[PDB]
Each structure stands twice: as structure tokens, then as C-alpha cells.
Symmetry: C2
Subunit: 596 residues, 2 copies
Amino acid sequence: GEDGIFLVLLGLLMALVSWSMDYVSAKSLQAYKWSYAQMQPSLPLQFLVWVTFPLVLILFSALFCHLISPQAVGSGIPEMKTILRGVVLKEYLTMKAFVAKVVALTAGLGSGIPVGKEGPFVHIASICAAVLSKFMSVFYYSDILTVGCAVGVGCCFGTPLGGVLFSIEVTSTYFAVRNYWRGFFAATFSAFVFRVLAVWNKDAVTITALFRTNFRMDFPFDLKELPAFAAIGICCGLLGAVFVYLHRQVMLGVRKHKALSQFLAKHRLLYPGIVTFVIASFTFPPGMGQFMAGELMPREAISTLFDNNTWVKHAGDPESLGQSAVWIHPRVNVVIIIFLFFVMKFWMSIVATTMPIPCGGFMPVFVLGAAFGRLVGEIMAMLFPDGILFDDIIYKILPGGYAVIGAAALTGAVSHTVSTAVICFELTGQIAHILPMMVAVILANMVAQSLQPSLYDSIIQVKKLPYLGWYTIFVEDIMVRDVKFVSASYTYGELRTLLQTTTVKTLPLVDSKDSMILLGSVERSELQALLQRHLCPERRLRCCIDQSPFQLVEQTTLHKTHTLFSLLGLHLAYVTSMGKLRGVLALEELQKAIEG
Amino acid sequence: GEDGIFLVLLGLLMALVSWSMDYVSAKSLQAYKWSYAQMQPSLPLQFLVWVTFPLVLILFSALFCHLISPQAVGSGIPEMKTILRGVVLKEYLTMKAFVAKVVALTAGLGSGIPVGKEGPFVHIASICAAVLSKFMSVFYYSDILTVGCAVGVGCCFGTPLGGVLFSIEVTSTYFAVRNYWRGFFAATFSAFVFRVLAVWNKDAVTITALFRTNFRMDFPFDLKELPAFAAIGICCGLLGAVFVYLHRQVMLGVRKHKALSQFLAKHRLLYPGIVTFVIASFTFPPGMGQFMAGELMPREAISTLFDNNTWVKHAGDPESLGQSAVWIHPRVNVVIIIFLFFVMKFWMSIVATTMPIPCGGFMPVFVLGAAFGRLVGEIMAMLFPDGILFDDIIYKILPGGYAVIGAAALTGAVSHTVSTAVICFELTGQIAHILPMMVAVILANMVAQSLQPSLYDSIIQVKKLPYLGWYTIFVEDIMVRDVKFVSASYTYGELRTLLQTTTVKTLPLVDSKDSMILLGSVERSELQALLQRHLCPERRLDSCCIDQSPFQLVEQTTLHKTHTLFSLLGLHLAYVTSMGKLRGVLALEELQKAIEG
């Protein structure tokens, strides 16, 4: 209803902003390709531009990322998933930086450097949610955050149900069912709006998701290479685990040393782009895309990975097909260029997410997963090129399903989740390999549970951002040992002293100053309005207390005190004994306890 | 791990049972069609058999439904969703009746009467979960129920993620994320096992879902009839609401009167089958399937609804295609037989779910939705038969997407949920109409929120099964005002009197008999084992401190928030003290009596 009006205005503006950003991204980067081709093939000058228009665009990006934004460098989802799990930072929830981030993200989005959209877009979507909530009540909190999360990811990719899942399944402990209905409503109306405008304005075809990967969908797998799918699970999780490890090996490499931070801060702004230099030194297409097919911006890259044809038998024919023509060097085998492509995008991608950019950890890992999938699909084409039979028709395999299941599996391994597979097929446009990708997602996730933590927990761990998860433990001396006193029986100056002596917003109220049994709470404005209604007749002059419930039992273990404030989601712990108040136990002290 | 071994053995045996039941259903009902055709087309004799093998199979069904099962008639999901939301009935969770239900359900499944599998299959899956939990700890509770729910629906249809959603989104308030991970793991391993065995043994093709409805999936909709999709939402929810109203009009008709219950109980077992008699009088194919396409068991019926062809232009050709040949009468228009088909399945389906059968409320509503959808798709083919253009190619519409979106939409209206759309496309095998069916599911659900309650809440309401949901309210005199007393300081007979005087399993323990400030709890077996270890040296002849009970109930806690209190705790009692001095014990059924007001 009115809440539905809140959700639909949220989703409509969110879809407008997303359409605008990939509109600018597409036009900018096609102009990059345009000028790069059309000037002249000059080994000084095209190497000059193959460095420098990424280099202008990306020190331009980091310029906007760092100067205008006082704090919004390196933003994402884990800080706000910590916010909903307790640590509120209203200073980090500034309206002014939202607009300051997103255009920087557009310079991240129009780049050739593989970056992730999803994190900071979710962050600014929650910002938008809070802003419209601020506009509400002119015509609770973790609900707003959760709806913002779901709306953000589902309005990135037009994937409704996968987005509301990726809100729910990782960034929560318990969940209120109103907010899924809100998120489903808003998310599907958003993804509706996201696609229709790309036909009303500048045109997609009609109602594709993004991607139609027309497989044969008729005798697809078959069930003979099927346990080989088991193999295509396993090592993915292993490599995904390895990814986080070297990321931790560079999270240390974030700030292992201060002397190079000083040598940095001699001119601090300049940092990331130099390795952009060397990856440009590893990306130049008549330099190195001779061996790698470097002329692949990531969206068309994953589409050309998804081409429904066998490249062993397109090593059979040298026919210039569409963009898949870039997958040919005429001498050396294409499995080798896929191998080197994969590994160089890998030790490019760790640094690509390393640099001070607000970035999600999705887009490069799914590309590398898709690479791994099409590698092994083409070697399966190598091993049995004959194919198998059906009723007077010979059917041979096609590798794009292997690529799409791996492109689910690796980011499922990175983020310790499963809805990566749902948005995988819901982005794919066909649901052929659906049960193989969920089974392989299971296998990758259990291997990841076996070895390594998640991406974002390791991020907040090494960043030491305050949370944490869930012989001698003795827990009694944590409480805060002073609470104010109120009685309502008063004359003039006694009511004034109750106003003046106190500081905080709302007020706890006990039974008596001696018994100290807490009763309820008080607002100051009510007292002041009582003083108003008292004042109204003067110059020759002619709501019961809502109750605070509980007591903390003085030896409540860290796991179960953590569980206590988890279940409450509430402010304090008023500790009494025999009703006589003992103290107030708080949250950051429990964080200091869980440090041990 | 070991918990994963629990889940995978659960799902494998569950899939074995599901494969067995639809194996028997298929073979039985194809033998029905076989003999019915193959004897002779005799207007006495085939009418005899068109009554009587439905009539033998279904009083056979109800025979097994009612005699062996003492209480399992009319089972389903709403009673167990009330169990997980509080009212535990261990006597209803008997192992012995699980096997007694399912074979009865197979006689319900091999029937020609449209019944629902999903409810009682979820019920017996939770039974299996609890049974294997009983087998666990030889090598909490609502977790077992929730996993059982997801495993049950996802192992009915081989639809994993829709099953774990339909577990979560309706049968909960809050939810612990370990149990969804458990349920999806088990659910997808189940749907894996469910499909592969239908190729290892007697053969499906390879790895279809059930259904491949090969639409063109290339220029599918297009976006010109698109707001008409809006139209195909709206009235569906209205219609879904109407269904529940008449269901309530027969839920009253369950027991509006006692004299016909007496006239019934003159021979009580006989009740449902007489309308089975009369549904044969409107289904007999050279009697009424002349007007009905009566030779349609529901699974092939919904598949032939999903045939990718235009029946206005197959009113254009009289070509005998496949099973779609039953959609032809050569004189009168097929939209008319679709209309009468729809309405007669409607006032068939109300009675089909009325009768004392453990039944889910999905498959007949799925048929009626698919009927309505292909109805409106073919009239859209009637209104603009020309089709539209694309790049030197004329494209005309095809109605099966309209049928599949309506087959989502109406049961989405019935059950007040959204995962009906996920299992709709995930059963469909293609995801063409994905955003239209979710949008239409939204429209149906908001119309349903506007008008009517859900199916199962109305069921437990009229059945008056104890729950309930969420000027002068004063809430202080609910508590139970006696608690026992324990001290641990004792000699022989004092410890024996503490053993003998008490009744319940565990024991609350207060500070002193005067201060009455509650401390913790006690087991009896610990007392008996200390007396044992004391006995051990005799005839010339320390590891567990008291674990604490925490809380106090504030004596005026409102019904909404006391309901919320026991919701958040999920726990037994409410120990009410004042100043620490214990006042009473507030319980759950008393709160149910309060929420009666």
C-alpha cells in the first residue's frame, strides 16, 4: 500500500540510476574501442592510447573516489552487514557521498579493469532507502537495510529473486517475513522497470534477461560425462579458497609496512594506476592479446565464452565467426591461450580488487570461473570428440554449460553462499544445467567450509572492523554502574532540575532510589509539553509509564550473551540482583570480551 | 558432515518412496485406460467401468484412509505448521500411521479424482525426519520440522529451491540460517536422486524436470500484449479468493448440521464416494467428455494444455495432432468447451478437496489456473490472429505461456505465497515468462491480501485447531500459582522424599522458600546416580553446578507482546515474580484462551 508506494518509488529511481550508469559505461567504452581502432594502428600511438585512456579514466576514477569522498574509499557490503548486525555508523551513512560514489563507480564501470558493481551499489541503495525513509513521515532499521540490500543487488542485474536471496541468506541471522515480501515486491518491480526502459528508450530486443545463451536444450548433458561434473565442482572450491588466501596475503600487503606508506604519501593519490601500467603492459592486444585475446571487455567476454560451438572443431574450421574469431591464434592451441588467459586474469584480479576502490568481489571471479569451465569443456571435447548417440542422430557436447556452471561455482566458493547459482541461471536465460550447478555449488561450498573463511569476513577481520561472530570464562564485571533517578511528584524547580541535570534522549526509571528496581522510560519533550500546558493560563493566572522489562543474570556466557543481544536486537542489559540494580552491560564491552 | 549424512540418507529414502508412489500411480492408471479401451466400446459396460474402477479405487482409498489410520484422515501441512508454531501433538506424530497414510495416498495418487500430494507427503517426510532423529544418538524440534517440510515438497516434485522456499516463507516467523542450509543441501540432493533413478531404472529421457514445454523463447511475448498480462493477473486473485469462500461455504458444509451426520453414521464409511458416482456422470467421455475432454488424467491434461500451437488456427486445421486431438469437437468452438471445462472442474474441485482425504490444495488449483490461462491465450489469438512483425518475419502468439502464468497465479492467490511462481517456472523447464509471472503473482497476492484469508488459516480456523495469529485489555491473573521446593543439603530420607514427592521431568529451583527467587533446574537421574555412587562402597562401608533459569515476566504484558515474548523465546513457561518473590507461572494454552477474546 503506502509501504508499497515507498517500495515502488525506491525501485523506480534505483532502476533509473542503474540504466544511466551502464548507459554511460557502454557509450564510453565503445568510444574507447572506436577511437582506438579508428585512429591508425600505430605501435607507439596505439600503445599510448591502450595505456592512457584507461589511465586517464582510472586515475580520474580514484580521484573522485578519494578526494570528494572523505571516507567512502573501499566501500561495500561487509561494513553494512556489520551495521545491521550491530555497529551503527551514521557518519558513514552520509547522503552527500552517495552521489559522490556512484559516478566514481561509473568510472569504475566504464573501465576496462574488472571491478565489482554489487557492493557499493547495495551500499548506496540502502542510502537511498534511508533517505526516502527520512522523507517518510512528512506525508525498523535493519529492515530498511535488508530491503536496501535486496533492491540493490536485484536492481544491479535485474535478477529479482536471486537478489532478495543474496540479501537474506548471508547477511542475517533471523528474519522478519514482512521484509521478504517487501523485497520480493520491490525487487521484481525493479527488475521489471530495469528491462522495459531498455526498449522504451535505446533498444534491447524485448525482454531478455541480459543474456540469451541458446544451447540445444534438447538432450543436453547427457548422463555419461555427468560424474565429470563432480570433478568440475571440486577443485573450483579449492582454487576459490586459494584466492582468498592470496588476498589475505595481500591484505597483509595492504599495510604490512609503513616505509612504503611514507614513500607513497610523498604523493599519496598516485598509487593504483602504476600497476594499471603494468597490466596495460600485459593487456596490449598486438603486444599480448596476440597470445591472450586481450580485446575483451568483460561483458562481451562472458558472452563469447557462452558461444554454442565446439572450438576443437572450430580448430577444425578456421572460419571467421562472430566475436569468437578472437579465440584463434593460427599456430598454438587455444587451450593454451585459455590457460594463460585464466592465470593472468587471476594474478591481475587479485590486484584489481586490491587497489583502493569501492568494489564487489563477484565480477572477476565469475569471469575466471567461466574461463575454467570452458577450458574443461573444451578438453572434454578433446578427449571424446566423437560424441554419443540418440535415435538415429549423433550428438556431440558443447562447452558453454561447463563455463556457466563454473561461473556459478567460483563466486559461490568466494562468498560462501548458494544464491550465486540462482542468479547464475536467472541471468543465463536458460535453465539447462540447473541441477548440476546446484550440486556443484554444494560441493564447492562444503570444500570452502572445510578449508577457508569467506571473502568478506576475512576483509572485516584484517581490516579489524568491530563485530565478531559466534578453560576460564567468568563474566560478571562488565556492567556500567551508574543510572539516574526520577520522581514525577514535583514542583517548579524540581521539574527544572530533572530537565537540566540529565543528558541523554530517553530516560530509564526505577521503582525507588533505594530499591532500584527499574520500571520504564521517559521522554523530555513530554515534560516540556506539561510545562507548556501548565504555562497556558498564567500571568495573574486567570500517559502512564511504559515499562522496561528485564534483568541480566550476572554470569551469562559470551556465546549466550551474544545470543541474548542477538535475540533482542536491543540497547542495554540492566543487571539487578534481588531487584536492586547492579549495572548496565553494553555491546562494545562484549566486543572487547570476544577479542579474547 | 555427519549431519550431512543424516540429510542425504533422508533424501535418498524419501526419493525412493516418491519414485515408488508415482511408479505405481502411472502403471495403475495406464492399466485403467488400457482395459477401458480394450474391452469394447459398450454404452452399458464402459459406463459400468467408468464408474466402477474409480469407485473401487477410491472407496478402496478411503477404506485405507479411515480404518487403519485412527486419526490420519484429512491430514496435511496446516496442523504441522501449527505444531512448529507451538501446539505439539506427539500422538498425531505416530510412526505407525506414516506407512498407513502413504499407500492410501497412492490410491489417491493413482486416482482420476484431482487430489493434492504435497500436504501429506510433507507430513510423512517430517515423520521420517523425526524417526531418523530417533535413530540418531545410537551411532531443535522445529528445525527438524522445517527440514522435513522442504525435503517433502522438493522431493515430491524434484524442485529444490522452490521447495526450500515454500518451507521457509509460510511456515515460520523468524528463522535460523543453519536450517535453510541444511534443507537446500538435502533438497537438491533429493531432487538429484529423484530424477536419475527414472533413467537408471525405467526410463525418462535424461534430466528433464518433468516437463519440457518447448516454446519459441526467441521473440516470445512481445511487449504489446504485455499490459494484457496485467489483466491476466487481476481477476485470477479475485477468482482464487472466490474459491476459498466457497470452500468456507462447504467448510460450514463440513458440519453445518448433525442430522445428516447421524443419517451418515447409519453407515459412516460410505460418505465421499457417492459424489465420485456423480462426477462420473459428468466425466464419462462419450457421455460428457464429448463436452469435457474427459479422457484427461491431470498430468497429461496440463501437459496438453502446454502444447505450443494455436488452436484457433488448429480450428484452422482439423489435423489430428497428438493428445491435443481431444481438444476438438467438430461443431462447437473450443473456447466454449474450455469454458465449460473450467467451470465443471471448478464445482468438481470444491468437492474433491471437501471429502475426508488427506489432501494438498495445489494440483486441482493448478489445473484450473492453466485452464483459465489457455482460455485467455486462445481468445487473444482470436482477437488479433494476425500477429506482429520482426525483421522480415511475421510472428504470432502462442497461448501456453498464458496458461503457465495463470497456473502460477491462482494457487499463489490460494496459499498467500510467492514461491508458487518459482516452482512454476522451475517445473516448467523454461523461464520465458519469468518476470510476467512474478509480477502477476504480486498482483494476485495483493488482491488476496485485500479480500480474503489464506487456504490453510481458514482450514485451521473453521476446524478450530488451537493457535492463533498476531478498549479494555488487562493481563495479570493468568499465572499458575504453585512451584515445588528443593534444597540439596540433605541426608537419606530427605533425598528420597525429594525423589518421591515430585512428578515432572525437570525441576525449577528457587533461592529460598521465602524469597522465592528462581535459580535453575534439576534432573531426577542425577539424584539417583549420586545415591548410586554413594551406595557403591557400602555394607561395612562435583561436576555440574546448577545451570540458571534467567527471567521474570512483568505482570502486565500485552497479548500481542506476550505472544511475541513466547515467539522470540520459543520456550516453555513464564516465571512471574515481583521483587524476585515468585508470583506465578504463565503458560501457553491460557494465552490461547486470551486470544480467543
